Design a protein around this ligand. Structure first.
Ligand SMILES: *C/C=C(C)/C=C/C=C(C)/C=C/C1=C(C)CCCC1(C)C
Ligand SMILES: *C/C=C(C)/C=C/C=C(C)/C=C/C1=C(C)CCCC1(C)C
Ligand SMILES: *C/C=C(C)/C=C/C=C(C)/C=C/C1=C(C)CCCC1(C)C
Ligand SMILES: *C/C=C(C)/C=C/C=C(C)/C=C/C1=C(C)CCCC1(C)C
Ligand SMILES: *C/C=C(C)/C=C/C=C(C)/C=C/C1=C(C)CCCC1(C)C
Lengths: 217, 217, 217, 217, 217
């Protein structure tokens, strides 16, 4: 109906994710060979999100609850790719080690795992939330003042601007998710749909813009 | 049947939209790298329209009413892309700022939002209609005598002709939609199907023609 | 079963149309950029035909009648593209005006519209049939002794041979359809399936052969 | 179950055919423009076979019999393409007339038509079988000591080896099908599934190997 | 639910396999023509695995058992391709005979066939397990100290590193499967899902990394 404001968002986000997947997979022609992997991973993130959103909508229609397990599965598939996009754009613009890829991957996995262990009641909410936030802040530090920044200082100003915009998304766009978690252990589906919009489409658009600019110039 | 003249139009428009989506995604080979983004966005518009038309047909078969929410969702996804096609073709032919992209996007969003707020009864029909028409006229001015025209004067005559044809579509092809709104607050589905034909397929065909001409010459 | 000889033809034609669509969309690699649009339109015709044949088969399974409206929808989408293939191949081989594109399009539309107005009983069978035949003969004249021939005389002999073969298809392959109409107003589904084979697959194969020859040589 | 040994083969062959279709359509990048048509036709054969095998499996699940009509439809679509692959590989390696294409096509069609006329009881089993075998042997002669061999003697040794391997498949791999026919008019579904494996996947693999070798060297 | 830990793994692995298939088919642009076949085969393995995992999930939903036949069908299609990836990467980096391709294929087929003959009770568990392990060790020897190693010593150090990593996967990643077999004849579905992750996605990622490095450098 026109009063829930949740199914409307579900449909809007699902169609936008499909559109973004097609856009990312098609626009690899405008970028050089180095940036094609970044655009491919961006498109993979949007496609996996669309894939899981279809089943989440199906479960919403059948039962009418929140599929926490399905959202965490989508996260366990997409958050590592989104965090490794930093390594990808740094590799397509300068010499990045790959140690960064490893540590970012590990941090994201830890963050998700402990978050789920708090969601499922396996571990007490406070401890799991604190550990997940520590993993989040560790990824933030690696992208802000750690190895990621050291690789960022040897890149082109366009790549640096894209890196900073993506970092701001990781700090403020991502902060939506733990906040809801906090609220759950002391609207959410709508908030997560809009947040996935911001964190799945705008992220890839920033990557696409910088890749196209670098290839053209 | 052969008397409604509405389901026939639904099927015709849906098949035409699918055909147009395939055509736009396939014909990116004849255009240069700069015009590929324009053709991609055109194809995305047609694909989203087809996607939502399938579900609108499903709802028509099940219940048999007009899905206003679904049409406005399709609009909220396609109208911004269609209006940003102006920025796209100006970027693939001259130096356009991107401020135009921003302002056009904002105007289209305002137009749609206020239109829906009048459709759902949230805001009185008159005020919302006036605000939406002001947003429409603001987009018209930006494409006619504003920043869009300033970027248009530094383009090739073929690009200028495509720009003027698209502007005439924005003025007269788009005027179909508010008129129906006016009539609703004082056939429509058939009119909107034919209008989507005009405003979703002919628009992309104009873009494709100018892109192919520019790439070939 | 093995006695109707109609469902067998339905399946054969549907699979052949899908195969032809894939072939046309894939074989655009062997042709130059100019001929890619012709191959794309050919593939679009076969794809739309396949698309509508699936639903015609569904209606045949459910009810078991002849969907005149569905066939005329398929025609209203495919006949204009097939007739504009002449303009396409003339544009990819010499200087054709585009006035030809306009007049051919108009003639095909008139032919289909009046034919349907005779099929639905809106207009008397004789007058509508005569007007449709006049439109058919006008297209024949434009392709035989009119503007189309003038553009044909300035083309390569391979393109001229393809043009003449396509013209013979337009004269004799297309004459199947009005004949049935005549018989209806004084087997048909099987005849139309085989005719669609001839007029949808062989036509595109002639176009593909000439395009490949021109690109290779 | 694990005792029929027929549904297992159905699933294995169907998945292999889909895999082969994707492989053939994807691997056109490693071949020159001349060999792309051969790879496309190979992929079309596998795709049509997969398409019809899906419906054959559906009919097997519903009723549980042998769809002779469906197999002969698949043959009427695939056998001409498989036999014309000889003309294709000869055209992409030397000067072949195209008369070969015509005569091979005619022979294959005659073989299939008379075979079906014997299967459906229209014509006596003996006469139809003899005529079909004569058509088969005529195709064998045209590929062994006729026009096909004359075109083969002017090709590269790799193309000659591929031609001979394909000829051995036409002689011994194809002989599976009439033998079953003989047995039927005096296990079969399993035999035909494995034979389609041999005659639909190995054939295309031989073609792909020779095309890749010719393009690389 | 959140307690089985098996359906979660099923969904995770299925989505990851689809993502990997798309990634492998898309990333063929960054590799040279020689490595395209390796990436294609990798993508085929992931696609076949996804294809069969969908039906395995369907059978799990309907009945709720372990489809041994379906897993062995997936193996009979994917294990030969995975083992022939060694020949592929050796061919795209040095002169490998193809005798290796033959012997590896034969060994994998023997391993699978005898394994199934032990699973279905056709042959006693001990003898079939011993023969399958002998085939496994024969493949290990051919990749470690046999013809595969001789071809490996004439390759680039990056290709040698990829070869050694793949060999370690064949030794330790693959050892998961017979161990379960042993346990079955004296959790498993979860173990096989995670093992397919390791042996279907990481394998292709190693291949993709080495191919991209070789093409770039
Ligand atoms: C596309 C989906 C994305 C990008 C999801 C991101 C989710 C997070 C960044 C979640 C973070 C969490 C914490 C920092 C606290 C622990 C629980 C969380 C998982 C929600
Ligand atoms: C593909 C769909 C398109 C291009 C829809 C366009 C819709 C409009 C331009 C609607 C305009 C309206 C006004 C100017 C008045 C307010 C209400 C409206 C939204 C129908
Ligand atoms: C793919 C479908 C095609 C090419 C259909 C073509 C149909 C015609 C050329 C029909 C012609 C007719 C007349 C000339 C008389 C009026 C009625 C007709 C429409 C069947
Ligand atoms: C993919 C399917 C293929 C290649 C089928 C081939 C079938 C034949 C070569 C059948 C031959 C027959 C005869 C020679 C005798 C007449 C009856 C037949 C049709 C089975
Ligand atoms: C993608 C699936 C893969 C790579 C499956 C691999 C399976 C094996 C390597 C199985 C090996 C076995 C033995 C060595 C003992 C005999 C029984 C087995 C088949 C499970």
């Amino acid at each position: 109906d026109a009063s829930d404001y949740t199914g409307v968002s579900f449909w809007l986000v699902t169609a936008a994710l499909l559109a973004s997947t097609v856009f990312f997979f098609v626009e690899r022609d405008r970028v050089s060979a180095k940036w094609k992997t970044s655009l491919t991973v961006s498109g993979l993130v949007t496609g996996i999100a669309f894939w899981h959103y279809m089943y989440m909508r199906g479960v919403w229609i059948e039962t009418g609850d929140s599929p926490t397990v399905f959202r965490y599965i989508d996260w366990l598939l997409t958050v590592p790719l989104l965090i490794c996009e930093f390594y990808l754009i740094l590799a397509a613009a300068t010499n990045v080690a790959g140690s960064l890829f490893k540590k970012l991957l590990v941090g994201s996995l830890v963050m998700l795992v402990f978050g789920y262990m708090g969601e499922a009641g396996i571990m007490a909410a406070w401890p799991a939330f604190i550990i997940g936030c520590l993993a989040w802040v560790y990824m933030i530090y690696e992208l802000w003042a750690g190895e990621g920044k050291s690789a960022c200082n040897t890149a082109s100003p366009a790549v640096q601007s894209a890196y900073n915009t993506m970092m701001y998304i990781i700090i403020f766009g991502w902060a939506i998710y733990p906040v809801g978690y906090f609220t759950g252990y002391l609207n959410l589906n709508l908030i997560y749909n809009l947040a996935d919009f911001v964190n799945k489409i705008l992220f890839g658009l920033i990557i696409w813009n910088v890749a196209v600019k670098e290839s053209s110039n």
